[PDB]
Symmetry: C2
Subunit: 314 residues, 2 copies
């Protein structure tokens, strides 16, 4: 069928890596909406087994891409809460759809509601320092740049120099930007007033898996007591704790770090190149969500009203 | 004699009130008195000369134990006597000490210009400095960096003697973008402050520091935000005393500065204290900008050995 082929198309795109995180969540919702429409299912139990199986294969496709797993769990919570309030229900197939639509308009407004709180956290003559290239943080820095005037230091992330296109994006909007070399984070930390970063994933204890320089960044921010603000919406909120059994690191080709033209020493040197870096929650100051700016120590509560505890493990 | 009445005039103005305003004038008057003691009392050798200076410095220290700039320059003259009698080991010794004392005095009166010379190395344009009380050395440190760069100094006036008022006017007259605040806001505006430059009453022998009250709070606020706490203080403010619990550290002025006498009957039930000096441990200090450099707190002990003999620590 069209839907099945689109499911393995999504899974193989996840495996190979061929988009932003908000587009990832939007495509996941579109896929799961299709799954609950076009498949035949009698009651909610079979559909939860189906959604669980497909979420298991999309999660096992790329386990470090947790936006798809989060949106699978959000849809599962929606299914078991739109079936709870009706407790084979005929209108249930419609009801979940509407909630999914109410989720999809909760999305596409996540970046605006995070950007609305920019002026409350960025002041005139401020110096902000960021790391990766996250669309949430650039909209945050481009909504605060409409009124106030500040300096932003975009420390590039070294293997995939992606703070380059961030500082190109920010300098087009008139923010006076500085590109760093990622070795100077402790050097320029004395000047920096706030650190605003984005995440790949917010783990359930308030810790976060982010771009590979963010822990080396957060240690400097904690050393100089600079507040580390984290701009990240509620699809990036994953209910997984940082256990050693599950691997959260992603490792890419060493050609990003040590090129293939080095030659014979590549048979002896072990080059690694991870792309994600665990930041423990005691180095964090705030999470600017789409629903506010609450502390890391509140994140567990945001788990309980987003994901059911039976849906943590799929 | 004129000398003797000048000795108890100095001792009485040390117990009771002021006299020399700044610590540099206090040390210069102390060398004047010590040089006069060398010249005018009769002594045969350096033994009873050391005993005489030791007991005079003992009474000048027991006059006001929290005024250590007097007690240091007694010990520097004792070290000078021991090192100008060592190189002759008499007759000409009475001259030699005087010459060294003169070389000490011109070592003074240029302590402030050698601390102010290091201003540009530690103060940068568009920075922001925080100071607690009126220090002559810190003010001249901020003056020398002002004529080349452009910064903004926050002077947290140290209540009850609102003496950061008299500094934030001195800094405002020289065009530094100064700001005086209540000093209950030390932690509040600490987040935006780049450096803290303070002065001392005394640098204790472990790099610890005795400053005007509210400095230890200032130091803790600086350590919280990891703001470097620079300390501008010359070598007469360097005393070879570790923070004993035996001898008295604080000085306690009248409670009228804190709670006025017009409060009425509640003054019979309320214990008001008003200390003027605060102990800052050396782990909150970053630098000691002396007149000889900018060395770390963990070098201060070595500066003791080059300045005061170990036998002269306790008088």
């Amino acid at each position: 069928s069209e839907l099945s082929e689109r499911i393995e198309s999504f899974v193989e795109t996840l495996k190979r890596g061929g988009r932003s995180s908000e587009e990832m969540a939007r495509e996941t919702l579109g896929l799961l909406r299709q799954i609950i429409t076009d498949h035949r299912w009698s009651n909610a139990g079979e559909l939860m087994e189906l959604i669980r199986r497909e979420g298991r294969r999309m999660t096992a496709a790329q386990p470090s891409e947790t936006t798809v797993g989060n949106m699978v769990r959000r849809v599962l919570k929606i299914i078991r809460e739109e079936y709870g309030r009706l407790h084979h229900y005929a209108q249930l197939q419609s009801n979940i759809i509407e909630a999914i639509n109410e989720l999809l308009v909760e999305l596409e407004g996540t970046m605006e509601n995070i950007a609305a709180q920019a002026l409350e956290h960025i002041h005139s003559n401020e110096v902000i320092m960021t790391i990766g290239f996250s669309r949430t943080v650039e909209a945050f820095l481009k909504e605060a740049a409409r009124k106030r005037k500040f300096h932003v230091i975009v420390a590039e992330c070294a293997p995939f120099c992606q703070g380059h296109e961030m500082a190109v994006n920010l300098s087009k909007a008139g923010i006076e930007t500085t590109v760093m070399t990622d070795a100077a984070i402790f050097a320029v930390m004395s000047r920096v007033n706030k650190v605003i970063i984005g995440t790949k994933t917010i783990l359930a204890n308030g810790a976060l898996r982010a771009v590979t320089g963010t822990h080396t960044l957060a240690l400097a921010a904690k050393h100089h007591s600079t507040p580390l603000i984290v701009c990240a919406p509620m699809f990036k909120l994953s209910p997984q704790f940082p256990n050693e059994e599950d691997s959260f690191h992603k490792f890419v080709a060493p050609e990003e770090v040590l090129p293939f033209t080095e030659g014979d020493i590549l048979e002896k040197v072990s080059v690694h190149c991870p792309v994600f870096d665990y930041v423990p929650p005691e180095l964090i100051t705030l999470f600017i969500s789409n629903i506010g700016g609450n502390a890391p120590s509140y994140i567990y509560r945001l788990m309980s009203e987003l994901y059911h505890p039976d849906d943590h493990v799929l």
